[PDB]
């Protein structure tokens, strides 16, 4: 546990003079206040000494690491800056596909944007916080108009704030962008400092929080969809939303790259940044864009559309945030395998899913889930296995290793802060227990409902034999009955009130449910 | 009890200045810190004084031993070092059968590997920690390609770390090997310090723990099977797994001896060592090898295959770790004698089995168990009895001498730490007791499940008259009904969900079950 205050008294234990900042406490570094301790999980980091570790490592640090060296410099040396290209056709072909028609070479020099010839892709260098050599490179390739994201090293390690060296200490405002190209246009005209999230609207690691501590006003601008706005609110929760602002999506509110290209004034958009924090009573002025967006994006009013369950899509109609669903059925039908396909399909579309399987030996679950990704049988394709490992090790996915209700819950709340968890999957609810059975089951399901709404994290529990008391607390139910042909029946839809049932044909060859 | 802290206050009682190491506490020797006290059971040992004993012996030591001399120097004087052999055909024959084709004479001198002519076997000398004369010799013989392990003295006394004098005090990295030959090749190329376990992946006694205290990074490499990796995790539990690493088995990750012979780069394998310690939430990067290994070793996904129960093999499919099974049946059928055959067969394949037979006069159990090992009637073969005594005194096996639930459990937990117990057999559960009977039975069975999962030690209880509450907590059940012809029925398989029943034809002559 951390409990915030216990950090302060431990600092008072050493008498370290500390100041309570927005999120991370600031104090003089014992190894101008360069020592930063996070309010939660206490991952320390010094602006000068550059030492990082856990809170227990910090505890041992007062008593008495990494290099990240890869052949990235070779790729950088084989790429040419865009503003230093004497060619005419090559640059014109580049700006058309990358949407750089209105981009001037002055901003290219400022952000050190480079271009590589072998793959015709952009280069967005990552610099060390201390101003040392390159830490990594992010490459974007356009194919047909679609942008493909691939960076070195793996996406799970990319922790770059594009423009971190550029921003000075005398800057009080910063606007965050989901991409890198839109950041260039925004700084081109407004002139205000700009930064980019590492993997867009996917996750903002706590390690990056100390760098944004100095800024006083933060204006989120993370896309042109209701999904982006919801992600912005979740990201705002980490840094005391009283000091942040939002830019709602809309028809007249495009992305900064599209806003400058389209000719729409962008300083006007930066002026209407409504606060993300409000009292317990609000008026219509802070909801005009949301109702306007909902009335023009009726499809976006629900969650993501599954790419593998057309029949389940027409009944549940989406996968929203904060709603809790309980799934149960007769044993022996692979109910654990079914939820694996459900979460994996959503995970590939940009949802950070946390897996809390119990009594299933999660190392065995990964084999089932990885076979689903290959959409076939991986036993015969053992030769082309390392390829799928790279594809599997880029989706946002985390497992849980092991039993009290409090123990799992604090880790789940810790998981949301540390990895931006937006989905929690738990297989065996009985294993968590460790009229008493009915009373115990009623308590835990109620606890999960408290966690689902408070943290806005979707939870899809699986019940091993259903409970009458669970129906009132839960928002959605899914029942997978048997009659390898099965069918799933839904009898509770909080968002839409629509029920139904469709057959499912399960094939053991590919470990993927299907329906003719 | 020890309770770790009570050791410190006892040292504080004597005012001994001590420092908390990884496992064994270090302090100045009262009889540069040479006094080593284990965190559990406090078996003391001094790097200079060389005095050992129990914690109570240490307690009496502040108030106010062994020689191990055998005719072993004769065997050493009758063996010739391999690097000092002028013969041509003899050495070529040796390296072919022992797989020393790529072994150079330089490493032979460094490790002082000797060869004996009478049996054409290798010699791996054991040196005292104080640099004294030889302590023992380990001999390996190749017959057809198979390696036979036999050492002097008995296996229960062999506590040699091959290369312990070789490693210096200024070494922070060490890699452990399951064999002795593979360690030679690993030091040949990498040059990093290496050590070998006394009896392979079977057991690492706590007496050797003080010698490995100095090293800060330990990289386990104990074979090329899922069994080896599981044994590594159990071994790593003793030495604060935060300071250890693992090398998972795989097709491209062979043993160090085969890795150098096959031409595969071994420094690459040493670079990809993954930590054995991790937070409650882990990603797919620390599971890529395990799922790859499981997908290519489908037989290894289960436990060991019994060599005497083909019918039991097809239903239970293996003997995993951590899982708990309850066995019961009508009395008078020798159900106690049945579990003796079950445990003895697995023990012969390299499983450290602990026996907790209560109310059976364990001296009487040994006669039954020893007759099973001889596979016949020992009364007639009393002349050839001293032979089987030596063969019986090399399998990893320990009995329990006597009643509360806490008393037996602490000994069982102590047994795992002292002898690397991976299997516990208890005969009578009623004797451990010493609606009340139902409530008491539910408590003890639940207590064992806590020990079964936490320590990963397999437990197979025997019930003397079945209990509904046991079914939920237990993973497997075996019922031995009667109709000397019997049959065993299984109705719960946690790992596979497969049930069945097969007849058993028990013969009282050999005390071994059989089936035509």
PDB file of C-alpha atoms in Angstrom, chain B residues 244-350:
ATOM      1  CA  UNK B 244      17.838 -14.731  -9.802  1.00  0.00           C
ATOM      2  CA  UNK B 245      17.034 -15.401 -13.452  1.00  0.00           C
ATOM      3  CA  UNK B 246      15.827 -18.298 -15.586  1.00  0.00           C
ATOM      4  CA  UNK B 247      16.592 -19.765 -19.006  1.00  0.00           C
ATOM      5  CA  UNK B 248      13.450 -21.443 -20.295  1.00  0.00           C
ATOM      6  CA  UNK B 249      13.759 -24.724 -22.216  1.00  0.00           C
ATOM      7  CA  UNK B 250      13.126 -24.728 -25.939  1.00  0.00           C
ATOM      8  CA  UNK B 251      14.142 -26.086 -29.309  1.00  0.00           C
ATOM      9  CA  UNK B 252      16.723 -23.301 -29.729  1.00  0.00           C
ATOM     10  CA  UNK B 253      17.746 -23.412 -26.036  1.00  0.00           C
ATOM     11  CA  UNK B 254      19.597 -26.709 -25.504  1.00  0.00           C
ATOM     12  CA  UNK B 255      21.783 -27.715 -22.585  1.00  0.00           C
ATOM     13  CA  UNK B 256      25.181 -25.969 -22.337  1.00  0.00           C
ATOM     14  CA  UNK B 257      27.029 -29.130 -23.390  1.00  0.00           C
ATOM     15  CA  UNK B 258      24.812 -29.611 -26.446  1.00  0.00           C
ATOM     16  CA  UNK B 259      24.683 -25.872 -27.182  1.00  0.00           C
ATOM     17  CA  UNK B 260      28.446 -25.681 -27.719  1.00  0.00           C
ATOM     18  CA  UNK B 261      28.525 -28.995 -29.594  1.00  0.00           C
ATOM     19  CA  UNK B 262      25.670 -27.887 -31.851  1.00  0.00           C
ATOM     20  CA  UNK B 263      27.385 -24.606 -32.713  1.00  0.00           C
ATOM     21  CA  UNK B 264      24.614 -22.400 -31.317  1.00  0.00           C
ATOM     22  CA  UNK B 265      25.850 -19.170 -29.756  1.00  0.00           C
ATOM     23  CA  UNK B 266      25.587 -19.479 -25.973  1.00  0.00           C
ATOM     24  CA  UNK B 267      26.192 -15.842 -24.995  1.00  0.00           C
ATOM     25  CA  UNK B 268      22.931 -15.048 -26.793  1.00  0.00           C
ATOM     26  CA  UNK B 269      21.124 -17.590 -24.604  1.00  0.00           C
ATOM     27  CA  UNK B 270      22.790 -16.121 -21.511  1.00  0.00           C
ATOM     28  CA  UNK B 271      21.631 -12.630 -22.529  1.00  0.00           C
ATOM     29  CA  UNK B 272      17.910 -13.495 -22.764  1.00  0.00           C
ATOM     30  CA  UNK B 273      17.563 -14.626 -19.141  1.00  0.00           C
ATOM     31  CA  UNK B 274      14.170 -13.666 -17.735  1.00  0.00           C
ATOM     32  CA  UNK B 275      13.565 -12.745 -14.082  1.00  0.00           C
ATOM     33  CA  UNK B 276      11.835 -15.307 -11.895  1.00  0.00           C
ATOM     34  CA  UNK B 277      10.346 -12.491  -9.783  1.00  0.00           C
ATOM     35  CA  UNK B 278       7.564 -10.262 -11.083  1.00  0.00           C
ATOM     36  CA  UNK B 279       4.709  -8.067  -9.912  1.00  0.00           C
ATOM     37  CA  UNK B 280       1.105  -9.234  -9.608  1.00  0.00           C
ATOM     38  CA  UNK B 281       0.543  -8.116 -13.229  1.00  0.00           C
ATOM     39  CA  UNK B 282       2.713  -9.431 -16.075  1.00  0.00           C
ATOM     40  CA  UNK B 283       2.736  -9.093 -19.866  1.00  0.00           C
ATOM     41  CA  UNK B 284       3.314 -11.669 -22.620  1.00  0.00           C
ATOM     42  CA  UNK B 285       7.065 -11.006 -22.908  1.00  0.00           C
ATOM     43  CA  UNK B 286       7.788 -13.107 -19.800  1.00  0.00           C
ATOM     44  CA  UNK B 287       5.698 -16.008 -21.147  1.00  0.00           C
ATOM     45  CA  UNK B 288       6.763 -16.305 -24.812  1.00  0.00           C
ATOM     46  CA  UNK B 289       9.112 -19.243 -24.243  1.00  0.00           C
ATOM     47  CA  UNK B 290       6.696 -21.110 -21.960  1.00  0.00           C
ATOM     48  CA  UNK B 291       3.820 -21.043 -24.453  1.00  0.00           C
ATOM     49  CA  UNK B 292       6.270 -21.915 -27.233  1.00  0.00           C
ATOM     50  CA  UNK B 293       7.630 -24.795 -25.161  1.00  0.00           C
ATOM     51  CA  UNK B 294       4.153 -26.035 -24.263  1.00  0.00           C
ATOM     52  CA  UNK B 295       3.059 -25.895 -27.914  1.00  0.00           C
ATOM     53  CA  UNK B 296       5.985 -28.144 -28.918  1.00  0.00           C
ATOM     54  CA  UNK B 297       6.021 -30.430 -25.835  1.00  0.00           C
ATOM     55  CA  UNK B 298       2.346 -31.388 -25.511  1.00  0.00           C
ATOM     56  CA  UNK B 299       3.356 -34.493 -23.549  1.00  0.00           C
ATOM     57  CA  UNK B 300       5.336 -32.338 -21.097  1.00  0.00           C
ATOM     58  CA  UNK B 301       2.227 -30.251 -20.346  1.00  0.00           C
ATOM     59  CA  UNK B 302       1.324 -32.927 -17.769  1.00  0.00           C
ATOM     60  CA  UNK B 303       3.338 -34.681 -15.071  1.00  0.00           C
ATOM     61  CA  UNK B 304       5.625 -37.687 -15.198  1.00  0.00           C
ATOM     62  CA  UNK B 305       4.501 -40.925 -16.839  1.00  0.00           C
ATOM     63  CA  UNK B 306       4.298 -43.845 -14.413  1.00  0.00           C
ATOM     64  CA  UNK B 307       6.367 -46.913 -15.297  1.00  0.00           C
ATOM     65  CA  UNK B 308       4.097 -49.401 -13.486  1.00  0.00           C
ATOM     66  CA  UNK B 309       0.494 -48.157 -13.981  1.00  0.00           C
ATOM     67  CA  UNK B 310      -0.334 -47.999 -17.707  1.00  0.00           C
ATOM     68  CA  UNK B 311      -4.061 -47.943 -16.922  1.00  0.00           C
ATOM     69  CA  UNK B 312      -3.708 -45.165 -14.343  1.00  0.00           C
ATOM     70  CA  UNK B 313      -1.542 -43.299 -16.862  1.00  0.00           C
ATOM     71  CA  UNK B 314      -4.321 -43.058 -19.455  1.00  0.00           C
ATOM     72  CA  UNK B 315      -6.855 -41.509 -17.050  1.00  0.00           C
ATOM     73  CA  UNK B 316      -4.871 -39.098 -14.843  1.00  0.00           C
ATOM     74  CA  UNK B 317      -2.373 -38.379 -17.681  1.00  0.00           C
ATOM     75  CA  UNK B 318       0.369 -37.278 -15.276  1.00  0.00           C
ATOM     76  CA  UNK B 319       1.466 -36.121 -11.832  1.00  0.00           C
ATOM     77  CA  UNK B 320       1.713 -32.321 -11.814  1.00  0.00           C
ATOM     78  CA  UNK B 321       2.796 -29.987  -8.995  1.00  0.00           C
ATOM     79  CA  UNK B 322       0.634 -28.074  -6.543  1.00  0.00           C
ATOM     80  CA  UNK B 323      -2.467 -30.155  -7.207  1.00  0.00           C
ATOM     81  CA  UNK B 324      -3.962 -32.015  -4.244  1.00  0.00           C
ATOM     82  CA  UNK B 325      -5.673 -35.410  -4.409  1.00  0.00           C
ATOM     83  CA  UNK B 326      -7.719 -37.310  -1.820  1.00  0.00           C
ATOM     84  CA  UNK B 327      -7.781 -41.116  -1.920  1.00  0.00           C
ATOM     85  CA  UNK B 328     -10.273 -43.322  -0.083  1.00  0.00           C
ATOM     86  CA  UNK B 329     -11.864 -46.752  -0.182  1.00  0.00           C
ATOM     87  CA  UNK B 330     -13.317 -49.594   1.883  1.00  0.00           C
ATOM     88  CA  UNK B 331     -10.986 -50.849   4.591  1.00  0.00           C
ATOM     89  CA  UNK B 332      -9.195 -54.183   4.433  1.00  0.00           C
ATOM     90  CA  UNK B 333      -8.195 -53.775   0.771  1.00  0.00           C
ATOM     91  CA  UNK B 334      -4.671 -52.559   1.534  1.00  0.00           C
ATOM     92  CA  UNK B 335      -5.309 -49.030   0.281  1.00  0.00           C
ATOM     93  CA  UNK B 336      -2.253 -47.992   2.298  1.00  0.00           C
ATOM     94  CA  UNK B 337      -0.220 -50.593   0.405  1.00  0.00           C
ATOM     95  CA  UNK B 338      -1.601 -49.280  -2.894  1.00  0.00           C
ATOM     96  CA  UNK B 339      -0.361 -45.724  -2.353  1.00  0.00           C
ATOM     97  CA  UNK B 340       3.036 -47.213  -1.478  1.00  0.00           C
ATOM     98  CA  UNK B 341       3.382 -48.539  -5.028  1.00  0.00           C
ATOM     99  CA  UNK B 342       2.117 -45.233  -6.441  1.00  0.00           C
ATOM    100  CA  UNK B 343       4.646 -43.104  -4.552  1.00  0.00           C
ATOM    101  CA  UNK B 344       7.598 -45.490  -4.918  1.00  0.00           C
ATOM    102  CA  UNK B 345       7.263 -45.694  -8.708  1.00  0.00           C
ATOM    103  CA  UNK B 346       7.297 -41.904  -9.079  1.00  0.00           C
ATOM    104  CA  UNK B 347      10.158 -41.593  -6.577  1.00  0.00           C
ATOM    105  CA  UNK B 348      12.385 -43.813  -8.737  1.00  0.00           C
ATOM    106  CA  UNK B 349      12.078 -41.271 -11.578  1.00  0.00           C
ATOM    107  CA  UNK B 350      13.485 -38.352  -9.581  1.00  0.00           C
TER     108      UNK B 350
END
